[PDB]
Nucleic acid binder design. Sequence first.
DNA 1: ATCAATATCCACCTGCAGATACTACCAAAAGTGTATTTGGAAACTGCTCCATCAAAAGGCATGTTCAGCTGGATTCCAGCTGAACATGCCTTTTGATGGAGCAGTTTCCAAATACACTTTTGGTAGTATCTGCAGGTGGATATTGAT
DNA 2: ATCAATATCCACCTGCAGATACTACCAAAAGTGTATTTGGAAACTGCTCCATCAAAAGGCATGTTCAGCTGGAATCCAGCTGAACATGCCTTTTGATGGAGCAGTTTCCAAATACACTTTTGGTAGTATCTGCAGGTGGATATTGAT
Lengths: 104, 106, 99, 99, 79, 87, 99, 99
Amino acid sequence: KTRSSRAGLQFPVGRVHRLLRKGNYAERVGAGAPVYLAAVLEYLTAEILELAGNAARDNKKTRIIPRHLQLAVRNDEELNKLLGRVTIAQGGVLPNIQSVLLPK
Amino acid sequence: KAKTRSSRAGLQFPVGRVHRLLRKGNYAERVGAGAPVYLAAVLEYLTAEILELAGNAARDNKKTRIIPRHLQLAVRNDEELNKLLGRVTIAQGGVLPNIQSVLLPK
Amino acid sequence: KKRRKTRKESYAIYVYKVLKQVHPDTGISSKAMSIMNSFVNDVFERIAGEASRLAHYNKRSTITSREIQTAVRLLLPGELAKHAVSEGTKAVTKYTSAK
Amino acid sequence: KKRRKTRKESYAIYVYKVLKQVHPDTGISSKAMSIMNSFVNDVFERIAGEASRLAHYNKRSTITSREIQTAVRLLLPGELAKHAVSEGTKAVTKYTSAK
Amino acid sequence: DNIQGITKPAIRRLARRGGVKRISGLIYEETRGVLKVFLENVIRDAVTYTEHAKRKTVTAMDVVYALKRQGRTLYGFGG
Amino acid sequence: KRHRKVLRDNIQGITKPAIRRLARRGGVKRISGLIYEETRGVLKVFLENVIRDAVTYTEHAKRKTVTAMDVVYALKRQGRTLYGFGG
Amino acid sequence: KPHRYRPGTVALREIRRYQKSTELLIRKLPFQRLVREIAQDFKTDLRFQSSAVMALQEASEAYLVALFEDTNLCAIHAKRVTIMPKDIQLARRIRGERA
Amino acid sequence: KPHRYRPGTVALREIRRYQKSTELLIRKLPFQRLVREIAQDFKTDLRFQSSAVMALQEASEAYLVALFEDTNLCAIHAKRVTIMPKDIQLARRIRGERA
DNA sequence: ATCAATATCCACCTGCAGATACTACCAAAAGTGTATTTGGAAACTGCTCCATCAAAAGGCATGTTCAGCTGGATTCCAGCTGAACATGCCTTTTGATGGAGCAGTTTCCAAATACACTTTTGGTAGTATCTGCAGGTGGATATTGAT
DNA sequence: ATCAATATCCACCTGCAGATACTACCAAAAGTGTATTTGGAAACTGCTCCATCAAAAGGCATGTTCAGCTGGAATCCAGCTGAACATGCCTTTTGATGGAGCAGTTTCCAAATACACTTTTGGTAGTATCTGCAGGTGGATATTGAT
Ligand SMILES: [Cl-]
Ligand SMILES: [Cl-]
Ligand SMILES: [Cl-]
Ligand SMILES: [Cl-]
Ligand SMILES: [Cs+]
Ligand SMILES: [Cs+]
Ligand SMILES: [Cs+]
Ligand SMILES: [Cs+]
Ligand SMILES: [Cs+]
Ligand SMILES: [Cs+]
Ligand SMILES: [Cs+]
Ligand SMILES: [Cs+]
Ligand SMILES: [Cs+]
Ligand SMILES: [Cs+]
Ligand SMILES: [Cs+]
Ligand SMILES: [Cs+]
Ligand SMILES: [Mn+2]
Ligand SMILES: [Mn+2]
Ligand SMILES: [Mn+2]
Ligand SMILES: [Mn+2]
Ligand SMILES: [Mn+2]
Ligand SMILES: [Mn+2]
Ligand SMILES: [Mn+2]
Ligand SMILES: [Mn+2]
Ligand SMILES: [Mn+2]
Ligand SMILES: [Mn+2]
Ligand SMILES: [Mn+2]
Ligand SMILES: [Mn+2]
Ligand SMILES: [Mn+2]
């Protein structure tokens, strides 16, 4: 029986634990640390996949490409801050023209 | 204790301490013998460089004891040091005197 | 097997699981999967990093889930933080309630 | 007398030594010395941090002087970097050739 | 008062150190808003360090660490 | 039997139409004539900085090939973290 | 006539005066008040080391002064000498504080 | 007689076009030679994984586009619609790339 | 041009915060000597992928002509913002006193590490067959701009 | 408000790249089970420094007046810059090559950790003496702004 199932998770608790030792973040790693972290990662993954899938859907597509990931992130105030210094390859930008540039 | 590793390396900065600080740092599983020597040297040098300029700045202002203002003028007047400490704030440093020319009389 | 290329692990199968959970009929391009993978590693490091620092700041040689938690509060914005904390605590509680 | 002692070490004495070598008739305020201490700490952390990543990227469990060197190259402005490497190699030689 | 305690002449002094010659009437209100947001952002993080360390006092290190991670490193309080 | 023709003046390969296109994505409607030379300059600096670090990684690794991770680590440490190319 | 200085003459004199000094420019207590009130929103019954308050004041003033520089630069960009809210707003948006 | 769109109409058409797509806008090969030229001036006999060349271009266009936005914000600040070098310069000064 | 009102400057003086210097005391820190462990350089080489060349073709760059409309200049004045002066309200300072709580200390156990097997799994590899959509077409509708 | 040139739309289609499906294999990962070790929570508390007064002392902020001078509106025009056109080049794409260099493997030892034992030293604390320069003086002269 895995620790992931034991903690009710999709994300690998064993791996996360391993990578935490390997990474040299502290002398010791408590058993609850990789669990909590697998949890958070799985949650954020879920959040962005919900929103990206929606944008995929809004554009009549069934396969999420990076455009959708970008759309999802930049259209969401919080993920946009979390990734305010991250560039998503092949993402383009949000349609957006400044007002004074339109005619009348 | 025979000879301090700092004096073996010809340095004022504490090689031994720098070494200990590296291990407890959780920077790598291990630490070579040359590394604390090298780094201690590197900190020492940079320290000299700042005190040097900052010293000069004390002179310029008719003074013999360095205050923060002096370290601030030292750093901001030096292209490279200013880049290195470009996201750093020196407390009680004030700013360099600089007025934009279009604000100058007539 | 060609002098067996040493294994390159990623989060893909787990992202994929989670994907079927939220949008059961949606696929994901391998470039988009690549972004997702970078996404997860990036955030892993940021949280582990903050934790690493927290423990150090407090002369603690162990990173517990309490470090992971503050790390999450320090790093993520408002609502993502609240939910992340929530899902994390829950999952730990479940984990320890076993046995 | 060992109770409320909990040692608070700083680079301050070693800063002061270096001061006299370059400006033997120049002194330094408390606040100023404190800035200098923050300075050495900051730079220690930057260099050490970068040297750490370097080692991890290259799957190495040991931070050597080579890592400190590349770290410096990556971190210090050209000319400041050049002299730093020079000072660095020097002290590592002087040390090897010593007793 | 409070935020309103950060007075017009004080805001004027800062501006001056920043090289400013002529100041629009609306600046003082705008400025206070900005300063509020700065402090909120910093204090939150600082306090969160306080809570972690199980204390009821915000220490200078609490602030320093928070500044550092706001990308606003401060020298001279690392004692 | 071994080539490498001299590489020079390749900055001019950042053509005026390509720079215009970029300004468009950037939301720009009207472009002064002096922009193109200016933009070439700004890109040149950007590349130099990224490659310098990228190559420092390659070298430290005793390799002769600049890998995408090199560029990735280089980008990260300049606060231009990039997703999509590994790591 | 009694004696009056042209508008802008004293302002210049103040810029020159304040770029020369380093003393903090906000009254200490109104500031301490402000700090405490904001904090109370995050946790109640808080005490502040006095050095912690000073850190915060040092940091804010540095921040505001530097912001006024960029602000001044935006006003000059539009052929003015009078800083306006749109100038602060632009500077901040370009800093990534609003983007 | 021949039809003529008014000045600005194609520009807007183009902004819409490009904001809608994600493909790169600098021709691949010219870009590569630039990268290769610049790298060579740092070190000779270097080679490049093609993905490393692409990593650079994706990063570079991402940077330049974002810059133009800031620039466009500056021109509009000056009450213009035409971006000029002084706009790029103001932008880069505030970003802390210049001064 | 004058000349007056202020600011600003330099020399000198002196009190005192804060730096200096002496002495004692001690843990924790640093060196040194001995026993053992292993990270990762060297050597050899399998196998990926980078440089390079070839040849074909058309997408897109270059260069030009032309005039539309933007930027840049000039003028203008209404009003908002600086300067100054008069109050007086609260920040500052200070010296002094409880007492919150941070920090040092001893205790001890729940949880972490070490380790030895044992089982499970994700990654790759190979080979073979689906499926979302880019990009091509053609024809209907929407936007623009000249009257 | 009409008409016509052109962009834009969308529905339709089809190759096909990329995504997917199966089998097969296994080295590393992960779990399980003990033995052995200890990080830091807990609880008691001592003393540092924080909150709170009191209490002038006055400094500095606030309110008001008045007018200079700046911001922004309106007007003009020269020429820069966008749109369209013609021509054709060099990027792109498709495919094939040797071979440089990265990356996998096994060998093996210079240098690391791991402990212990001795010696040192940087920090703290207690007491005492010393001094760089802030802040106050006065008197020269420079700046600014009115004639
Ligand atoms: Cl834990
Ligand atoms: Cl070493
Ligand atoms: Cl405004
Ligand atoms: Cl310009
Ligand atoms: Cs790390
Ligand atoms: Cs946060
Ligand atoms: Cs550098
Ligand atoms: Cs004078
Ligand atoms: Cs005095
Ligand atoms: Cs051409
Ligand atoms: Cs033409
Ligand atoms: Cs249409
Ligand atoms: Cs097709
Ligand atoms: Cs206290
Ligand atoms: Cs051509
Ligand atoms: Cs071409
Ligand atoms: Mn060259
Ligand atoms: Mn080994
Ligand atoms: Mn004309
Ligand atoms: Mn105009
Ligand atoms: Mn008037
Ligand atoms: Mn108590
Ligand atoms: Mn499996
Ligand atoms: Mn299509
Ligand atoms: Mn213990
Ligand atoms: Mn004007
Ligand atoms: Mn070879
Ligand atoms: Mn001593
Ligand atoms: Mn003085």
